[PDB]
């Protein structure tokens, strides 16, 4: 986690056109690899893996 | 080989981080024994009296942060022992710990 | 072996407490044979039993 600084684009607010800080959480997201496909089929008992 | 001796240094502060005041030195000796078992494979470990004095030099709670030891894997072939190799650890007094590497020391 | 008797006798002969009495760990077998004060006097003179010095308590800091 860290913090940033940004403007505000909210009219009618006490922070409009003002610099504010905000807490942010960093999530590292490497690209994912797709290695298969499942199909689901609807049943009167729910979705089941076809 | 199976007889050679070596010189190591141990971060006693790292291995005793978290131990209570009245168990820091005995826990240090237990961790030294476990360390001697790790790099040698010999369950039989003998801790020298001078090394024990160096460990207990600053009391029971202020164990020195690092120590410079010398492991020697000698033959236990002096009696009918289950293990034929025993590790004797000694204390090597040093003035500083900077740039100290593990070295294979001859007999 | 056990040298409980010898150390007590050595303290009595040396006229000092058991704290100051030092018995040679190497020659344990020889001391174990000593069972009388007369033998202890021999061992003390022979050096196997040594009276340790009083622990240093300097008054130089006080001075």
């Amino acid at each position: 986690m860290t913090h940033i600084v940004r403007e505000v684009d909210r009219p009618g607010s006490k922070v409009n056109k003002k610099e504010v800080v905000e807490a942010v959480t960093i999530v590292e997201t490497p690209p994912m690899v797709v290695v298969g496909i499942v199909g689901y089929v609807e049943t009167p008992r729910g979705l089941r893996t076809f | 080989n199976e007889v050679v001796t070596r010189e190591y240094t141990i971060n006693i502060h790292k291995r005793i981080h978290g131990v209570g005041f009245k168990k820091r030195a005995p826990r240090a000796l237990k961790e030294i024994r476990k360390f001697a078992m790790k790099e040698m494979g010999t369950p039989d470990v003998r801790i020298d009296t001078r090394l024990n004095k160096a460990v207990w030099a600053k009391g029971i709670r202020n164990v020195p942060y690092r120590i410079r030891v010398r492991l020697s894997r000698k033959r236990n072939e002096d009696e009918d022992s289950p293990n034929k190799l025993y590790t004797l650890v000694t204390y090597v007094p040093v003035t500083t710990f900077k740039n100290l590497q593990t070295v294979n020391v001859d007999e | 072996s056990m040298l409980r008797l010898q150390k007590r006798l050595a303290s009595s002969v040396l006229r000092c407490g058991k704290k100051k009495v030092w018995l040679d760990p190497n020659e344990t077998n020889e001391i174990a044979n000593a069972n009388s004060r007369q033998q202890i006097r021999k061992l003390i003179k022979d050096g196997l039993i040594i009276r340790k010095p009083v622990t240093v308590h300097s008054r130089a800091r006080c001075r």
Partner: protein
């Protein structure tokens, strides 16, 4: 998402990159070096490296 909080453009003016391992006060290596000048470790490093 139709509220003004949502679909709101976000533009960052500054991102904090100080040392989280304690109480940081510098953003970059160059900034810290420029503020603190040369140090003993670098002086002896150049002393050995000529």
């Amino acid at each position: 998402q139709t509220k003004r909080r949502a679909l709101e453009k976000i533009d960052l003016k500054f991102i904090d990159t100080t040392s989280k391992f304690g109480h940081g006060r510098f953003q970059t290596m160059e900034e810290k070096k420029a503020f603190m000048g040369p140090l003993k470790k670098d002086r002896i490093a150049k002393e050995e490296g000529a």
